[PDB]
Symmetry: C2
Subunit: 66 residues, 2 copies
């Protein structure tokens, strides 16, 4: 799915701009490292509670992932 | 932080948008390819919606998914 791949690319860009590895974003969001990578690649169907964990880790409002 | 508490805020927002469009829960479930029980659960903060279902709901409402946040 194209939109799961566009959402994962936005997540990747926000993470990368802040200089965090996948491993660090996974720790900060309380997520498994491989699950964060699978979301970045559109290979997971992330829950809302985890979108909010990831937005809190990036210090951004969740709307900005959309 | 207890981010499941924020599901309640998102559910209220969805019910605001669904009512701003004049749809019943059953209509918005049909239009999003979902079911009335699950839509109602999400409006109440009692189900943890997925991204693909957030996009389905936004498509059915004819909004950008960002207006849900």
């Amino acid at each position: 799915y194209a939109d799961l791949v566009k959402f994962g690319q936005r997540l990747r860009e926000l993470r990368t701009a802040k200089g965090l590895s996948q491993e660090t974003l996974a720790f900060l969001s309380g997520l498994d490292r491989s699950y964060v990578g699978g979301v970045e690649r559109g290979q997971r169907n992330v829950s809302l509670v985890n979108i909010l964990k990831l937005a809190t880790a990036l210090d951004i409002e969740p709307r900005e992932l959309f």
